[PDB]
Every structure is written in structure tokens, then in C-alpha cells.
């Protein structure tokens, strides 16, 4: 009999039961999607969309639902942060229920196709035995895929009939679902350009329908037919697995490095935005412009929105988490509740001191307050270690601009050390660490979890492609030698 790892090979020469098992898998996938959406809506907290975005609460399916236009719920709230009017059928709960019903229907269809398998459709008219004309099925399926791709790219993203897609400004402050006009030209291959999505989908749909027609009309050559073993079905599996892990690599890379298809308002900021001081540079430029206008320090620093300062914080960096630090970010370092402001450190002489920000790659980084030219001026020494430039000796004073703590100056060395440690991470924020019993250690963004899972799956599927290609190209000796 079959060993435990060969049980699913009983449908290798029975098209009806193959259709049945593939239907069962589709039903399971749809049911998972529906159940996960329902759970996410049950857990989601839409109270504050500024300091508590959906990517902060460890939401995985909600960003993907929101990416394509689902922005309302039957609970009376919207993802933007306004009251929901006439939500309609296509809400979060509606999508989850629709997926569940689809899963049930697919389950019933799978049961039917399993029960009745001896169909005349799968019988060769000449020989009378089960057969599949793989090139023609491929042509039909490619035709359908191209048609669907063109429809999506011409009616959904363009907003002609559909709702559009999520687009945001470069710094992720004002984003929403909008129609996207196609962008033909050198751009569009610019990954961060939303018009590339529409242009690509339209062009790829046209090419796909043309190729489907070709593969439907033209028979393969005998040399190619024998070379690629088009008579067998396992070569189809090997090629499909190959394309699948290729796609997995591409999607994981696009997710990790960011793109127009992965907005930061839905999945969170990127490791490389913290590496290059993206938000820090934007904030500095804005405050410098306000200062040069003629305003003082306090009012200029108060103009900075809390969202932009929140993005400039190492807690939201997806590369600061851990493998077994499970859960949402809010369980990591509490729920953000307010922005204290920008902290300026000044020695007794008057020189402004800047604290060196922790690189995204260190677990523990010593706190150092540098001069304007980079010379070290102050530093908290290692625990219980003799010091020569400590905070107490140098006499560093911290003053805050904008935010909750505006115009307040502290001179006590203890609070100065505390705020220096806080500012080592970036912007200082007040955190509620009691609601969720947060541990105190950073978790990882949904971006990081998605990338990790999909790269691991892609590697495993590369191995699967190797194995199945070897099996299909060595069938004579694999017949049980």
C-alpha cells in the first residue's frame, strides 16, 4: 500500500477527483479568509487612527481588504476615522460573510465532483480512456486569466466602474482610495507610481488574451511535446510550482522594500526609511522652513503633525522585532497616547547637544549626546561604572518644544537621563502600558511577518519544484526500480 507520504497520489489519473480535491482546497482557503476577517473585525479598535493605526494592532487581512477599497464597516465607523453612512453590501463583515458562503458552496461542489467522477468529458473519443489535452486547457485558462486581468486593470483600478485603489502622499499623512489614471511612458515601471498598476494590468491582460488565443489555436510541435513531456500532468505541477515561488520572491521583495502596492498607512513604515532618516529629514526641513518664516521654536515645532512624528520612531521599524515576540505592536511597548514633543539638550555652557540615534541593527545601544560637530560631550556611563562625562558632571538640561510638554524645562539629572534614553529611540511618546500588559520589548510589523513567511514558503517551494521536476523527468526509473 501507499506510504503516508504518497496518499494523495490516488487522484493522479482521475480528473474528476482531482477537481474535487482542488475544490476542497479552494473552499478551505476561502473559509480561512472569511474567519480571519471576522476575527480581525472582532479585535480591531477604530477609536484612534492617528496614533493607533491598523498596522499597529497586528492586523493582517484588514490592510489587504482596505487596499482595494473596503473602507467601511457595519459598526458605524470608517478606516479613515469618520462615521460610516450607507455602508452597503461591500463592507468588512459583508466581505467576510461572502467569503464564508463561497467556501460552503465550493465544499458542496467538491462533494458532488468527488461522488460523480466517471464523466464522458474526460474520456478520449478515440481510445475511450481517461485523458487530458493539457495545451488546450492551458490555453483556455490563460484566456480567462488575461480577460480577468484586463477587466481588473481597466474597470477597477482606473475607477471607471470600480472604486479605485489606495493612494497616499510620500510621507503617508493623507491617503485614501482613489481612481488611478493609467501612466503610459517611462514611468509606471517606477514602482512607487500607482499608475503603473493600471497600465501593467491593462497591457498584461491584452497580451494574456492574445497568448490564450494562440495557445488555444496552435498545437505544440512533436519535438517540444516530447521534450517537455506535455503528455504527463506532473510537469505541469513542476512548472506551476516554479512560477509560484518566483511570484513569492517577487512579492516578498516588493513588500520588504516598499512600493505603491504596499502603502505605509496600511502596513507601516520601512526599515530603510529609518535607516536613511526619511521622516527625520522631512520634519527637520518643515521646522526649518517654519523657523525661517519668522516663528519661534515652540510654535514652529507645534506645527508638526503627530502622525509624522510617530512615523519617526524606532518602535514602528519592522526590523526591531523578534521571532517569538508574538502579537501586535501594542503588546510590545504599550499603546501610543500622546506626543510629548521635541527634546532639546543643552549643556551649561549653552552648546546644543544632539543624542545619537540607535542604529536599526543594535539590540542595546549606549546613549551619547554629541556636539554639533560630532564630538562626544555627554554620555550615561555603563551601569555602576566610573565616569568623566556623565550627565551630572557636565550638567545637561532638557527642554521640550511642541506637543504635550511644551515650554517645560527639566534640570534634575534623573529625568534628564530618562528623556535622553527615550530620545535615543527617536521621537518621545507617551505610552499606555497597562491596558494590554505590554512586556516592554518591540514586536514586528505585519510587513516583516509577511516577508518572513513568504520567503520561507518560496524556498520550500523551490525545493518542491526541484523534486517534482526530477520526478516528472525520471518517471521511467521512478516507476519503482
Amino acid at each position: 500500500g501507499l506510504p503516508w507520504y504518497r496518499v494523495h497520489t490516488v487522484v493522479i489519473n482521475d480528473p474528476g477527483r482531482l477537481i474535487s480535491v482542488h475544490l476542497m482546497h479552494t473552499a478551505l482557503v476561502s473559509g480561512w479568509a472569511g474567519s480571519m476577517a471576522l476575527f480581525e473585525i472582532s479585535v480591531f479598535d477604530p477609536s484612534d487612527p492617528v496614533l493607533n493605526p491598523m498596522w499597529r494592532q497586528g492586523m493582517f487581512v484588514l490592510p489587504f481588504m482596505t487596499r482595494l477599497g473596503i473602507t467601511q464597516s457595519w459598526g458605524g465607523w470608517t478606516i479613515s476615522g469618520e462615521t460610516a453612512t450607507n455602508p452597503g453590501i461591500w463592507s468588512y463583515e459583508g466581505v467576510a460573510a461572502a467569503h464564508i458562503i463561497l467556501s460552503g458552496a465550493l465544499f458542496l461542489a467538491s462533494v458532488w465532483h468527488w461522488t460523480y467522477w466517471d464523466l464522458e468529458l474526460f474520456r478520449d473519443p478515440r481510445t475511450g480512456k481517461t485523458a487530458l489535452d493539457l495545451p488546450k486547457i492551458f490555453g483556455i485558462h490563460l484566456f480567462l486569466s488575461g480577460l480577468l486581468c484586463f477587466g481588473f486593470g481597466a474597470f477597477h483600478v482606473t475607477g471607471v466602474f470600480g472604486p479605485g485603489i489606495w493612494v497616499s502622499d510620500p510621507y503617508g499623512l493623507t491617503g485614501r482610495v482613489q481612481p488611478v489614471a493609467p501612466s503610459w511612458g517611462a514611468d509606471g515601471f517606477d514602482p512607487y507610481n500607482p499608475g503603473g498598476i493600471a497600465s501593467h494590468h491593462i497591457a498584461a491582460g491584452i497580451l494574456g488574451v492574445l497568448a490564450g488565443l494562440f495557445h488555444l489555436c496552435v498545437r505544440p510541435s512533436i519535438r517540444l511535446y516530447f521534450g517537455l513531456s506535455m503528455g504527463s500532468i506532473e510537469t505541469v505541477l513542476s512548472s506551476s510550482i516554479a512560477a509560484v515561488f518566483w511570484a513569492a520572491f517577487v512579492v516578498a521583495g516588493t513588500m520588504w522594500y516598499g512600493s505603491a502596492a504596499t502603502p505605509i498607512e496600511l502596513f507601516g513604515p520601512t526599515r530603510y526609511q529609518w535607516d536613511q532618516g526619511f521622516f527625520q529629514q522631512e520634519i527637520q526641513k518643515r521646522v526649518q522652513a517654519s523657523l525661517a518664516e519668522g516663528a519661534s521654536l515652540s510654535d514652529a515645532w507645534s506645527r508638526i503633525p503627530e502622525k509624522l512624528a510617530f512615523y519617526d520612531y524606532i518602535g514602528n521599524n519592522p526590523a526591531k522585532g523578534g521571532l517569538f515576540r508574538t502579537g501586535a505592536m501594542n503588546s510590545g511597548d504599550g499603546i501610543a497616547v500622546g506626543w510629548l514633543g521635541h527634546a532639546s539638550f543643552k549643556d551649561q555652557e549653552g552648546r546644543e547637544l544632539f543624542v545619537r540615534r540607535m542604529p536599526t541593527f543594535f539590540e542595546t545601544f549606549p546613549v551619547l549626546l554629541l556636539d554639533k560637530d560630532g564630538i562626544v560631550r555627554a554620555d550615561v556611563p555603563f551601569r555602576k561604572a566610573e565616569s568623566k562625562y556623565s550627565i551630572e558632571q557636565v550638567g545637561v538640561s532638557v527642554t521640550f518644544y511642541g506637543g504635550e510638554l511644551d515650554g517645560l524645562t527639566f534640570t534634575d539629572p534623573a529625568t534628564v537621563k530618562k528623556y535622553a534614553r527615550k530620545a535615543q529611540l527617536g521621537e518621545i511618546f507617551e505610552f499606555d502600558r497597562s491596558t494590554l500588559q505590554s512586556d516592554g520589548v518591540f514586536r514586528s510589523s505585519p510587513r516583516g511577518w509577511f516577508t518572513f513567511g513568504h520567503v520561507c514558503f518560496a524556498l520550500l517551494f523551490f525545493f518542491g519544484h526541484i523534486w517534482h521536476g526530477a520526478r516528472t523527468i525520471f518517471r521511467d526509473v521512478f516507476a519503482g526500480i
Binding site: 503516508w4 496518499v7 490516488v10 487522484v11 489519473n13 461522488t115 517569538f324
Partner: protein, 37 residues
């Protein structure tokens, strides 16, 4: 609708059972400390 020719039965001898049980218990021993954190 008729007796399907593709009929086969799965088997698992005692050695395979011991291998599987040992693998499961060893993996649990290795990962329990991490999961409990």
C-alpha cells in the same frame, strides 16, 4: 458512479510510528521553552 479503480490503502509499521512519536516529542521539547517565552 461505480467502484473506483484507483483504490489503495495506507500502511504505517511500528518503526514508523516510533519515529513519528519521537519526532513530535523532540520538537515539542525543543520549542516549548521558546513558546512559553
Amino acid at each position: 458512479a461505480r467502484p473506483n479503480p484507483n483504490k489503495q490503502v495506507v500502511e504505517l509499521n511500528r518503526t514508523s510510528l516510533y519515529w513519528g512519536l519521537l519526532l513530535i516529542f523532540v520538537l515539542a521539547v525543543l520549542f516549548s521553552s521558546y513558546i512559553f517565552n
